[PDB]
Amino acid sequence: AERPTLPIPDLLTTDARNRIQLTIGAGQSTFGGKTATTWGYNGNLLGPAVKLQRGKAVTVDIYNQLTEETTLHWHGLEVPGEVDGGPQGIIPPGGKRSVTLNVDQPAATCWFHPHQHGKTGRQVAMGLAGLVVIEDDEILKLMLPKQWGIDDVPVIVQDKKFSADGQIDYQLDVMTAAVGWFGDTLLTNGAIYPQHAAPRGWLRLRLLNGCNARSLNFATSDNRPLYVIASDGGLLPEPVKVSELPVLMGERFEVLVEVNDNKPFDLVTLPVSQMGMAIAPFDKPHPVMRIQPIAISASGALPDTLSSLPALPSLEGLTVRKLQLSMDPMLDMMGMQMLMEKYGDQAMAGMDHHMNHGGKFDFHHANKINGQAFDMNKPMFAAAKGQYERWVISGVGDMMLHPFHIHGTQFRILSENGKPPAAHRAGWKDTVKVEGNVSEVLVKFNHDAPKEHAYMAHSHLLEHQDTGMMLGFTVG
Ligand SMILES: [Cu+2]
Ligand SMILES: [Cu+2]
Ligand SMILES: [Cu+2]
Ligand SMILES: [O]
Ligand SMILES: [O]
Numbered sequence: 001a002e003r004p005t006l007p008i009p010d011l012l013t014t015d016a017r018n019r020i021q022l023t024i025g026a027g028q029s030t031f032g033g034k035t036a037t038t039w040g041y042n043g044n045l046l047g048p049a050v051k052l053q054r055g056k057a058v059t060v061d062i063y064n065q066l067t068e069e070t071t072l073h074w075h076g077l078e079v080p081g082e083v084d085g086g087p088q089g090i091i092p093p094g095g096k097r098s099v100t101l102n103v104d105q106p107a108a109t110c111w112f113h114p115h116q117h118g119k120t121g122r123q124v125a126m127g128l129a130g131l132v133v134i135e136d137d138e139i140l141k142l143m144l145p146k147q148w149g150i151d152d153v154p155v156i157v158q159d160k161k162f163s164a165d166g167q168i169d170y171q172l173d174v175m176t177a178a179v180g181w182f183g184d185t186l187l188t189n190g191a192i193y194p195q196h197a198a199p200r201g202w203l204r205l206r207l208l209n210g211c212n213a214r215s216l217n218f219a220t221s222d223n224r225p226l227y228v229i230a231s232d233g234g235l236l237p238e239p240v241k242v243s244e245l246p247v248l249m250g251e252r253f254e255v256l257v258e259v260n261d262n263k264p265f266d267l268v269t270l271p272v273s274q275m276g277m278a279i280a281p282f283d284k285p286h287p288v289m290r291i292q293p294i295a296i297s298a299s300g301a302l303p304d305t306l307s308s309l310p311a312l313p314s315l316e317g318l319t320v321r322k323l324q325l326s327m328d329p330m331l332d333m334m335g336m337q338m339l340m341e342k343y344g345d346q347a348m349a350g351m352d353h354h355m356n357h358g359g360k361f362d363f364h365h366a367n368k369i370n371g372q373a374f375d376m377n378k379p380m381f382a383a384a385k386g387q388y389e390r391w392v393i394s395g396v397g398d399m400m401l402h403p404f405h406i407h408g409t410q411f412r413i414l415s416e417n418g419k420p421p422a423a424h425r426a427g428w429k430d431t432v433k434v435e436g437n438v439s440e441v442l443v444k445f446n447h448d449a450p451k452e453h454a455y456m457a458h459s460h461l462l463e464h465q466d467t468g469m470m471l472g473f474t475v476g
Contacts, residue, residue: 003290006194008149009131009156012048014058020050022072024091024128025065031185032192034166038127039066041112045190047130049154050112052077054136057102064091069116070123075250076110076232076410076430077101077132081449081475084407086456087117087376104446105410106307107139108132108234108428109154109206109252117376118172118364121181121212121462125170127190129156129210138307139235145204145256145300152300153196153203157269157288158210159183172466175342177363178327178335179276179400180213180463186269188289195264195290201298202256203291204229205267209247212462215274215401218288219244220257221266227302230254233410233428235307240424244270248403250460251431253424256302259293266290271350274401276339278349309427312412312442319389321381323457325434325469327398328366365468369457373468379454385476388444390414391457395434402434402464407455408475411443431460448476 014020027044028035041047052058062072069092073085083089083099091097110132114123131154145151161183163169170181188194209216218226227239232252245253257267267288271278339347365373370380383389393404395417410428413421418437420426432439449455451474458470 003195006196007189009049045127049131071115073115080447081453106234107136154206175338199296199298202300217270226255228424232430237309273350321391323393331366367469374470379472399436402459411441414440445475
């Protein structure tokens with residue numbers, strides 16, 4: 001039994017009406033020989049890669065064929081609130097919604113996923129996610145690996161867990177509200193440990209951590225390096241060689257890796273220091289995909305310089321915003337308890353050395369920002385348009401992982417959890433790590449967001465987002 005080949009999302013561009021059609025629906029998938037109900041865009045699971053060009057507009061027709069409400073958000077894409085597809089961007093079951101995307105940012109790998117109010121974790125777990133490939137005139141000139149599905153390949157990495165009958169086992173409950181939804185099964189573009197045949201020379205991997213709650217850390221099985229060429233919001237100024245690459249939920253990195261004849265190697269993910277995430281089989285390096293070299297030459301390049309990264313401006317005078325994240329200590333303790341009871345000491349491996357009391361104690365609004373669980377009816381503030389602000393995000397008070405994502409922007413990290421960002425994280429980012437400490441980012445919003453269609457700012461640990469760790473804000 002050979003490994004299955006890596007599934008490759010179709011690369012989708014506009015029709016003569018300048019339209020892209022996306023259908024959201026339920027179908028079936030097979031995992032380890034057992035059928036499961038799954039959801040996808042234009043298919044049963046996951047989704048296509050929407051190709052966009054800077055300075056060109058496209059219209060997307062979104063047909064919701066689910067029997068429940070959903071929304072469609074373009075994570076990493078800088079668009080006005082009205083088409084951002086946050087929780088206010090409801091698409092009724094059996095209905096259609098169209099959005100016009102006016103792309104105005106550099107080449108990047110972004111993605112799209114649902115943002116249904118309090119149910120985002122389930123709708124992603126069930127299968128919904130797709131990709132966005134933005135191109136511009138600058139990137140084409142670099143002559144990067146660019147044959148889609150051959151030497152330029154998307155790698156969407158996600159865990160799931162399943163019940164004995166084969167269905168996806170998703171429950172938003174006290175334990176998962178506390179530590180997140182995670183599983184024992186790793187998927188790569190929906191497949192379990194596929195192989196990808198790649199030509200000899202450079203292979204470009206567009207990595208996405210599409211897990212609800214699990215952080216990842218990519219490496220190769222034989223320790224060849226990864227050359228990071230881009231982050232959430234696009235190219236770095238020059239490649240950054242790494243031996244390992246931590247990737248938070250919702251983050252993307254693009255890397256080049258060498259392919260040499262006769263020497264297959266795996267892309268792997270290394271055990272992380274996050275509660276619950278080092279339970280078997282994740283207590284050891286876990287393969288993601290096998291790269292199978294093909295004795296045909298790859299023509300892409302790894303250029304010395306990629307792009308121009310502007311200077312950080314002066315900070316004095318800029319609006320400082322305070323975002324204090326918090327969790328309910330009682331509900332945090334209870335969830336952590338159930339975790340430890342279920343899996344034992346292994347649920348903290350790698351870490352550093354029952355009655356109804358009513359609505360007030362409901363875990364569904366246990367997580368908050370600035371003492372408020374997400375309130376769709378009330379944006380927490382009005383941010384400035386076209387002006388840099390400094391947003392200060394604190395996780396002091398608990399030790400959970402909060403990958404913080406701000407909609408409507410690509411920002412620069414000034415401090416990541418109390419340290420200046422690593423070089424490959426110093427460019428354009430839409431996510432910043434917050435874990436027991438404080439982060440600060442420099443952000444600018446180029447588009448309007450009104451009260452009725454606010455931008456979200458939230459943890460991308462989906463179960464925390466769904467139970468309150470999110471705020472709305474307006475721009476302009
Ligand atoms: Cu987003
Ligand atoms: Cu997102
Ligand atoms: Cu979001
Ligand atoms: O997002
Ligand atoms: O998100």
